[PDB]
Design a protein around this ligand. Structure first.
Ligand SMILES: *[C@@H]1O[C@H](CO[C@@H]2O[C@@H](C)[C@@H](O)[C@@H](O)[C@@H]2O)[C@@H](O[C@@H]2O[C@H](CO)[C@@H](O)[C@H](O)[C@H]2NC(C)=O)[C@H](O)[C@H]1NC(C)=O
Ligand SMILES: *[C@@H]1O[C@H](CO)[C@@H](O)[C@H](O)[C@H]1NC(C)=O
Ligand SMILES: *[C@@H]1O[C@H](CO)[C@@H](O)[C@H](O)[C@H]1NC(C)=O
Ligand SMILES: *[C@@H]1O[C@H](CO)[C@@H](O)[C@H](O)[C@H]1NC(C)=O
Ligand SMILES: *[C@@H]1O[C@H](CO)[C@@H](O)[C@H](O)[C@H]1NC(C)=O
Ligand SMILES: *[C@@H]1O[C@H](CO)[C@@H](O)[C@H](O)[C@H]1NC(C)=O
Lengths: 311, 146, 207
């Protein structure tokens, strides 16, 4: 009795959609000047969003549509059009998918493999949908996004115990832009998430320096810390030191040095013979890259420093 | 058992069914009358004044809910069966015999209605049930006749 | 046994501690359904339906009924089966509506009334059941050990109550429990404890 078109709509969050309807009753076609729209038979759509395209065809539009929460076995919203009070039982279903997904990729210190992970906790809106990665390789590094690149090829990822889909890139190019995105892909079509470009050099995780050793200077009263610069990366970068009096729980206090070529620093401590735990992190100055893990704990020795003034 | 205890248990079951219906996420703001042209076999609209028509409405609602596999629907159907038994006992207590009458025999198109408007075939129906349930309580606050 | 607060399941057990002295027999549970009420003059039932339910770690046979009916009486018993015969335990009739365990009250708040000097507590009744309920409140001065004091409310329509306290400059802890007014049921769980705030109430007494 009533006809809707299009019957199936699949759109992302934030877009705009339109619907059309023709109603007939009592062997007569009702004029389009008395058609009102209902959403899920609960809220009444304001008249300001209505439109007339023909003598007996109505039109409605949706602005800043919202995420469709699933309720029971049904996972879609129904839109009705009808005259005055009597309304037909036929409905048009509307599907809304949140397409935005955060994908995190990290470059290992060896500059050989990329560890890429992402979560699927936002998929609860609609289940039984195919999620597939798609990354585009460019000889030149990524830049301002002109548009969606037609050339694409796929790559699979597996599922670990944490519930986050993970896959590893190998081998990798140091100065190649990997413009990657995720795609939801359903029996009704497909939707593509916004792309993201990652520079391989930008997200490098430096290897943690090792072989740290702290000592109390003799007849100087300062703390001497010795180690070696990590092999990767070979660029300039700053160092962070965190030390305390070793125990079950330790009250750390930070220190930073911004000179890459610097090897050791000196700093006095009020205490004279105290076992100390000293740790160092390594990070590039400008902010690019990720913080490295803490190194092995370095301990000191208890032994007399200078001649007592009061015996 | 005293008649007052039976009436109190009936009212408690009525309120429990109303609360259970209100907990469904589908029925948040649906009203209770509607004018769905394609759904006319569902009881409602016109009021009920006799026990025979009331049992007929209960049986039709039970048959409507039988076509749904949800656990909440099954629980509501069991509560409706208990309410029907209580109503039969109450009717017998007033020396007015009420024969057991089944539902409508020509409900076959109902199935077709489902494959057209399953969602709707649930939602409004549930709302209508709740509406009847409200009148249910009111119909027992005026001492109805046989 | 009892029924869930949501009125969706009814779960119970029996004992086997003193019966463990007489082993080698097999035990199983039989249940029969009445129409509306369990019985008034019990008699032997010729028809029964066995139920298969498992055993729990503490030694009590956990047994779950689902789905259940709120106003239908169940006649349950346990059959002892020995290599030479069988015996039946005395039957027990149970109404699920009379063994409902209500949920603890939600959103319980306590505060010292301004310019009054009384401690007021407010609460909201649980959704189930839809019958009259009685409340028992229990409060004291927060600390490692508390000397609480009980109070009862016999009005169903009441939601807030005010009581006097000796001290007006201490943190108080309040808990509430609800039960069916008619007494056909069990006691609920203790509500979420609510801690008051320390603030001035009245004007200073003396300089
Ligand atoms: C979906 O449509 C909106 C328009 O919303 C309204 O449109 C008119 C009916 C009028 O009432 C406006 O005031 C409303 O904003 C789009 O939002 C605007 O789109 C135009 C066109 O690109 C843009 O110039 C404006 O800046 C947008 N408004 C804001 C606040 O940013 C919206 O872009 C449409 N969605 C898509 C995916 O195009
Ligand atoms: C979507 O939900 C937000 C929540 O605050 C609301 O502000 C907005 O109006 C909703 N959009 C529509 C179209 O109802
Ligand atoms: C994604 O959907 C398309 C339909 O456009 C289909 O061709 C493709 O096989 C799907 N991908 C899968 C199932 O991995
Ligand atoms: C290194 O640090 C990251 C981020 O803090 C952490 O996820 C990882 O587990 C750490 N590595 C080890 C070996 O603890
Ligand atoms: C009772 O126990 C005997 C064991 O010898 C068994 O053969 C018999 O089947 C049992 N009866 C029932 C009803 O299970
Ligand atoms: C009630 O309290 C008991 C403590 O014995 C606990 O085991 C149970 O989970 C509690 N139930 C609820 C609903 O809080």
């Amino acid at each position: 009795d009533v006809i809707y078109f299009p019957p199936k709509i699949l759109t992302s969050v934030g877009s705009n959609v339109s619907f059309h309807c023709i109603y007939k009753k009592e062997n007569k076609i009702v004029p389009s000047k008395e058609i009102v729209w209902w959403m899920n038979l609960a809220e009444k759509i304001p008249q300001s969003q209505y439109d007339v395209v023909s003598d007996h065809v109505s039109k409605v539009t949706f602005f800043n549509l919202n995420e469709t929460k699933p309720r029971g076995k049904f996972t879609y919203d129904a839109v009705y059009c009808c005259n005055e009070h009597e309304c037909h039982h036929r409905y048009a279903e509307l599907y809304v998918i949140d397409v935005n997904i955060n994908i995190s990729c990290e470059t290992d210190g060896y500059l050989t493999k990329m560890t890429c992970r992402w979560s699927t906790s936002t998929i609860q809106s609609l289940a039984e949908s195919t999620l597939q990665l798609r990354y585009h390789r460019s000889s030149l590094y990524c830049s301002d996004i002109p548009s969606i690149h037609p050339i694409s090829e796929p790559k699979d990822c597996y599922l670990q115990s944490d519930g986050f889909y993970e896959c590893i890139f190998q081998p990798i190019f140091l100065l190649s832009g990997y413009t990657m995105w995720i795609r939801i892909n359903h029996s009704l079509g497909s939707l593509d998430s916004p792309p993201t470009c990652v520079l391989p050099d930008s997200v490098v995780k430096p290897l943690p320096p090792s072989s740290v050793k702290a000592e109390i200077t003799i007849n100087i009263g300062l703390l001497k810390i010795s180690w070696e610069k990590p092999v990767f990366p070979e660029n300039n970068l700053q160092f962070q030191i965190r030390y305390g009096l070793s125990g079950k729980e330790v009250q750390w206090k930070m220190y930073e040095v911004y000179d890459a070529k610097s090897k050791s620093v000196s700093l006095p401590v009020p205490d004279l013979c105290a076992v100390y735990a000293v740790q160092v992190r390594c990070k590039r100055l400008d902010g690019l890259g990720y913080w490295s893990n803490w190194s092995n704990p370095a301990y000191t020795v208890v032994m007399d420093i200078k001649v007592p003034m009061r015996g | 058992v005293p008649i007052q205890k039976v009436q109190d248990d009936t009212k408690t079951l009525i309120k429990t069914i109303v609360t259970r219906i209100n907990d469904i996420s589908h029925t948040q703001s649906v009203s209770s009358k509607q004018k769905v042209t394609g759904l006319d076999f569902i009881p409602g609209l016109h009021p009920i004044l006799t026990l025979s028509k009331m049992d007929q409405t209960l049986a039709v609602y039970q048959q409507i809910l039988t076509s749904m596999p949800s656990r909440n629907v099954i629980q509501i159907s069991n509560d409706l069966e208990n309410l029907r038994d209580l109503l039969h006992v109450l009717a017998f207590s007033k020396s007015c015999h009420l024969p057991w009458a089944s539902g409508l025999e020509t409900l076959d198109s109902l199935g077709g209605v489902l494959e057209a408007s399953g969602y709707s075939t649930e939602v409004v129906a549930l709302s209508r049930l709740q509406g009847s349930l409200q009148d249910m309580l009111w119909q027992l606050d005026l001492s109805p006749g046989c």
